[PDB]
Structure formats: structure tokens, C-alpha cells
Design a protein around this ligand. Structure first.
Ligand SMILES: CC(/C=C/C(=O)NO)=C\[C@@H](C)C(=O)c1ccc(N(C)C)cc1
Ligand SMILES: CC(/C=C/C(=O)NO)=C\[C@@H](C)C(=O)c1ccc(N(C)C)cc1
Ligand SMILES: [Zn+2]
Ligand SMILES: [Zn+2]
Lengths: 372, 372
């Protein structure tokens, strides 16, 4: 069961516009970072390929896909496309990520799945774009690779697919995609929609409809979440899934935005808790298909996914970043959202300190209701 | 030149949905607060009236207006209206504020203007909904009363109308409405679009087009803005307007969100600086039409607008809140976004301490470029 990483430096050419949270290097950063740390060999790396039109059509509509392609080639928003397809605004702007980048990230998810079928284990850090809908862009996402991947699997004959989303935001796009089917179970932990995007969905009451009733589970969590609360929520919810769904295969979305240093979440988690969560899922369900996800702090993202890669790769996590890695991170076009924060430790060591505390009562009550 | 306040308690029945920033009482709170402080007489209060369909059509389209009305009566989102009119989402949800409340706030702006014509001075705290476009809801706004009011004025024969927006967010809706005309000058101070809503407009380069070229001025400001920086920006930009535009009449939008205690802005201003800004405008352009605006902290909003009302009303600002006022604010359905903040002083005194400091170089450079 070989361990592979799907990616390419090319993503460095498909950044989001100047002020967009996603204009920072991410997967290409991950690759250069690991290389600087000598934590990956060319043999473990699989070059990303674009998704085929056929694969995309497994979930999205022709019209939407064609609009994305036209919008990108003309680098302009086609007539009425802005309101009909939700492209062109500050959220899902025109760029070369809208189709070329997204397609490459989606094709990479299909490759990660192909490796699973071949008996290997793969990680696609560019995937996990969980917000896009069938025919509309949403939350920075143009193409929903998890939805494409899951449909890909169903067509291959799978009837019990599990999707676990650890991203700090609710996977509204994925939830909608399989809300009415019992062949797909969606489990998501995220900041409560009461105070975080998306604000319209992600509540505990949303359990699915029709045959899918009981096959969707949302675990909304409070602000200031600590490592103990996150792992508590994860463990309890996994127990709930285990007792009602026997998955033939599962996908795990690993956005790094739930980390303390990432401003797009009110969660204050550590690297180690993030890794631990990853190992907990594997202890319960074995090996699955691993995807990336939301993450807007370059240092947090690089260190966190490096931990994930070392776990899978079976290699020891070096205590500190070597000088080559420090210069890499320092050379990035970042800038902390908050002037006085002090994140210097991130350029020193890979693993951050544990960030625990007690498990709040509301968190326990939420999991309690969930079990019902 | 009598001083009037346009409003009604009825707004208390048109709150936004449960988790929306605008679900808190606002204008109705203002009214009860002033009454508890004995700072207003029934004679100074003018009951708000709905806008007529004709007044609304001065700016918005029939289709959009009809959609708002239908959406509200059926309390549902009409087919395709969500994407075509941007209603129904978490930003501009279905409620009784979408049309009844909005119409009342817009009619109130027309009344404030009618009082101006009659030689009086009026303040409409419910107005200043500066985000709505001709045919689409935006930024919590369904109807753009400033745009309706300005068009109302043009039809009355005015050819030089000035609009000053002190709300912490850019008036994209108003800017678009008069971007191509020289009969209307729009001046706006706001958080730079680089980090704040709206993110697509509000940049310094947006100076207008066609005959309106040079008749739109945006003053984008940095995070952590202090009182000295705000007044510096205000004074300098006003000088710029004075030298190129001789207004026959002007409207001033007074959203309270730029205050320290309001989480929807990275500005850290004080009550007194807010009032001072108000008096500075009046010192430069005399009496105008005063409107409300964005404001999401009930205590901040009540105290700030009370200062405004006392200024206009010619009455002394009481040092502290009496017990009746304290209980009023305390009885509100609020809850601080941040657990540990300590805003107890807000329930004690009306005026907050000055929040000054030096004027950053970038702020000076921005005004510098603006003058060009
Ligand atoms: C969509 C989203 C998170 C998605 C995610 O990570 N879900 O998985 C966060 C929004 C609310 C946000 O915070 C934001 C901030 C700045 C900005 N500009 C500076 C343009 C545009 C949007
Ligand atoms: C639109 C706006 C302010 C406009 C304003 O004040 N214009 O003058 C602010 C947005 C970005 C925002 O911060 C927000 C926060 C929470 C939320 N829900 C909890 C549903 C919905 C929106
Ligand atoms: Zn996220
Ligand atoms: Zn505002």
C-alpha cells in the first residue's frame, strides 16, 4: 500500500486575485516546503492532471462548466453569469483558478481515488473544495471535487460512501449534493452557522431527507474551541456514524482553517490536535482518501499538512525547520492580519504546543442531542 | 428652523431574523432610550410613513419592488428571485423588514427632506441604507433610501446635491447610482475594501465616469483607526469637496458602526469623535438632511445617536444614564460577540472617553493622493 502525494508547482500560477484570502501560495508552498525539509521523494509525488469534462459532468451541469471555461478564457464575466452562476464578485472572482486551477484540483481528487482502488493511499491537498453547488460557485469554490469524487465512486459500483469534513466551515455544497440519498453519509464538524459562514446551513437539525434521512450529521461548535473540545466532538460523532453506517470507502477533508493562527475561524486549535484528529479517523475507519481544504495562513498550512504527510509517509517529524525552510516561508507574500500577534514560533518548530482546556458544557450538550 | 426626529416604535416589529446582525432593536430603542432620559418631546417627533410606490420608483425598478412585496407577503422567496434579486440568503433574508420596514425607513427619508424644504431640520435614524442597487438587495439593504431621496431632490429642481457617508462601510449602491452625473457629489469615508465589505468597490481610483468624472470621492482607511485619524480624514476630504462643489443641499449618513464597540468595523472611534465629525460637517456646509446607517451594537447606537439628537435639539447632554435608561438597555436581547470585553461603562455614562493617538503616515498619504 504505497503512499503518494498528488500535486504540482503549477498551482502557483493559479492564485486568487490580489486581496482575496486565497492569493497566497498553498499546495505549491507545501511541495517546496517538504522539499526544503527533505521530507518527500520524487517517487512519492504524482503530477496532478486536469479533470476530464466527463468527470466534471458527474456533478456539475454543462452550462455552468461551459460558463467557467468561457469566463476564464475571456477573463470576463459573461452576460448574466454573475447573478446566475455567482461568479465575478469578490467571493468567486475571475481568474485562472476558476477553471484551470479548480479542474486540476478536481482531477487530483479523482487520481487520489484511483490510487485507493489500486490499493495505495493518496493525499490531494488541493481538493476539499466543499462549497460549490451543482450549477453555482460558492464560498471561494468553483468546482466541488468531493462531490465529483463521490459520484465517481458510485459509478464504480460503491453503495456506502462516507465523507468526513474537518474544515472549520460547513460543507453546504456537499450536504446538498447527497442530502436525499442513503448511499452517502456526510459528517461535518464546523463553526456554528449562527456566527460563521455559511450562515444558512450547517445546523444540527439538518439530518437529510427521503432515503437520505438520517444520513447527514452536522456538529456545530462554539467560538474559541480548544483541542480537547474538538477531539471530544470528533470521537463522539464518529461513534455515532460507526453505529449506523458501514462504509465501503471514505473521504476525509483536511482544511487547516480550524487552527488558532488562521483568522477565518474562531477555533483555536493546535497542529498536534489536528494530526491527532487525523489519526483518530484512521483508527476508527482504516485508510481512506485524503483531501485538503480551506486554509489561509501559509505557515499554518505548510506545517500542518507536513505533519499529515509525515504520518502517512511513515517518517519522523523533525523538531525544527531548517534554514532553507525558514527562508521559504519568509519569502512568501503574506502579512499577518493582526499587527501585534507574534507568530515567530511558526518559523522555528513544526509542531505547535497543545492548546487544551476543559470541554464546555454546550459542546457536551450538542453531542448529546446529536446522538438522538 | 424647528428640529424634528422622524421615527416610530413600529420598527420594533420589523427586526431581521434570529441570527442576523440586525435582529436587535434600533430606532425603536433610540426612541425609548431618549424618552427614558427625558430628551425628547412628542412635539419634536414625526411619525414615519411608508414611501409611496411612486417615490420608490424614483430609483428602483417595478419588478424588484414587486418582488420584495410578494416575497414578504408570502414570506417566501419567489422562483429565481434569490439569484436575480439577491434576496433569501443570510445577508438579505425574508422578513417584514424587506419591504414594510424598508419602505417605512425610506418614506422617513422623504419626510426628512420635506422638512428641509419647509425650513426645518430633521433626522431619520432609520435611513442611510446605502448598499441596495437599482434592482437588487445588497449588504443587508433592500431599498436605497439615500438614492430615492437624492432622485426626489433632482425632480424638485435641485442640480447640485452632496451626499456624505460616515458609515464605516463604502456606499457602493449610492456610488453606482450617481457615478455618471455631475449633479450629485458623493463623498465617503470607510474601511478600505481591501479588508472590508464591500470588497469590490470603495477604492480611491473610483472617481466617477462621464459627466460624473471627478464627482465621486472615496477615502479608504486602515484598521484600528483612531479619533484623530478619522477627523483628520474628514476635515481634509471636506476641504477637497468645498473647492470643487457648491451644494444647494446635502445629506449626511450617520451609521454608528465606526465606533470601537461595534464588531462590524475595525475602526476604534469614540462617541465624542463621532459627534465632533457631525459638527464639523455642519460647520463647513451648514444644515443638511441627516440619516442613520449601519450600527449593530445596541448600546453604542443608542448613546451615539442620543448625542446627535441633543446637539440638534440644543439640549445639554446628561453625564450619566438614569436608572430607567439602564434597565432599558439591560432588558435588550443582545449579548456581546466577545465574552471578555467589559462594556459596563456604556450603561453608566453617555459620552465615552476620547480615543486618540497620532495620525498614521498612510492616512496622510491617502488624503494626499485624494487631493490629486
Ligand atoms: C467564504 C469564507 C470561508 C470559506 C472557507 O474557508 N470555507 O471552507 C469566508 C468569508 C466569510 C471571509 O471571511 C472573507 C474574508 C475576506 C474576503 N476578502 C478580503 C475578499 C472575503 C471573504
Ligand atoms: C454586510 C455587512 C455590513 C454592512 C454595513 O454595515 N454597511 O453599512 C457585513 C457583513 C460582511 C458581516 O460582517 C456579517 C456578519 C454576520 C452575519 N450573520 C451572523 C448572518 C452576516 C454578515
Ligand atoms: Zn473553511
Ligand atoms: Zn456599515
Amino acid at each position: 500500500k504505497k503512499v503518494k502525494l498528488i500535486g504540482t508547482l503549477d498551482y502557483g500560477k493559479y492564485r486568487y486575485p490580489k486581496n482575496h484570502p486565497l492569493k497566497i501560495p498553498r499546495v505549491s508552498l507545501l511541495l517546496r516546503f517538504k522539499d526544503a525539509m527533505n521530507l518527500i521523494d520524487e517517487k512519492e509525488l504524482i503530477k496532478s492532471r486536469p479533470a476530464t469534462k466527463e468527470e466534471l459532468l458527474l456533478f456539475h451541469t454543462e452550462d455552468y462548466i461551459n460558463t467557467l471555461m468561457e469566463a476564464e478564457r475571456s477573463q470576463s464575466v459573461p452576460k448574466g453569469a454573475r447573478e446566475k452562476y455567482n461568479i465575478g464578485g469578490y467571493e468567486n472572482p475571475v481568474s485562472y483558478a476558476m477553471f484551470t486551477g479548480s479542474s486540476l484540483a478536481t482531477g487530483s481528487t479523482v487520481q487520489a481515488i484511483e490510487e485507493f482502488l489500486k490499493g495505495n493511499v493518496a493525499f490531494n491537498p488541493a481538493g476539499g473544495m466543499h462549497h460549490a453547488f451543482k450549477s453555482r460557485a460558492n464560498g471561494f469554490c468553483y468546482i466541488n471535487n468531493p462531490a465529483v469524487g463521490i459520484e465517481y465512486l458510485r459509478k464504480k459500483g460503491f453503495k456506502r460512501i462516507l465523507y468526513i469534513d474537518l474544515d472549520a466551515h460547513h460543507c453546504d455544497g456537499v450536504q446538498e449534493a447527497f442530502y436525499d440519498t442513503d448511499q452517502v453519509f456526510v459528517l461535518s464538524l464546523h463553526q456554528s452557522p449562527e456566527y460563521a459562514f455559511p450562515f444558512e446551513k450547517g445546523f444540527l437539525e439538518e439530518i437529510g431527507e427521503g432515503k437520505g434521512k438520517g444520513y447527514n450529521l452536522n456538529i456545530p461548535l462554539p467560538k474559541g474551541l480548544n483541542d480537547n473540545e474538538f477531539l471530544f466532538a470528533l470521537e463522539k460523532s464518529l461513534e455515532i456514524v460507526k453505529e449506523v453506517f458501514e462504509p465501503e470507502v471514505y473521504l476525509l477533508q483536511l482544511g487547516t482553517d480550524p487552527l488558532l493562527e488562521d483568522y477565518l475561524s474562531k477555533f483555536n486549535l493546535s497542529n498536534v490536535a489536528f494530526l491527532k484528529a487525523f489519526n483518530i479517523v484512521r483508527e476508527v475507519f482504516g485508510e481512506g482518501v485524503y483531501l485538503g481544504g480551506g486554509g489561509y495562513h501559509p505557515y499554518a498550512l505548510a506545517r500542518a499538512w507536513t505533519l499529515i504527510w509525515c504520518e502517512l509517509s511513515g517518517r519522523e517529524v523533525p523538531e525544527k525547520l531548517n534554514n532553507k525552510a525558514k527562508e521559504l516561508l519568509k519569502s512568501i507574500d503574506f502579512e499577518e492580519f493582526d499587527d501585534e500577534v507574534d507568530r515567530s514560533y511558526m518559523l522555528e518548530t513544526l509542531k505547535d504546543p497543545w492548546r487544551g482546556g476543559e470541554v464546555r458544557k454546550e459542546v457536551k450538550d450538542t453531542l448529546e442531542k446529536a446522538k438522538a
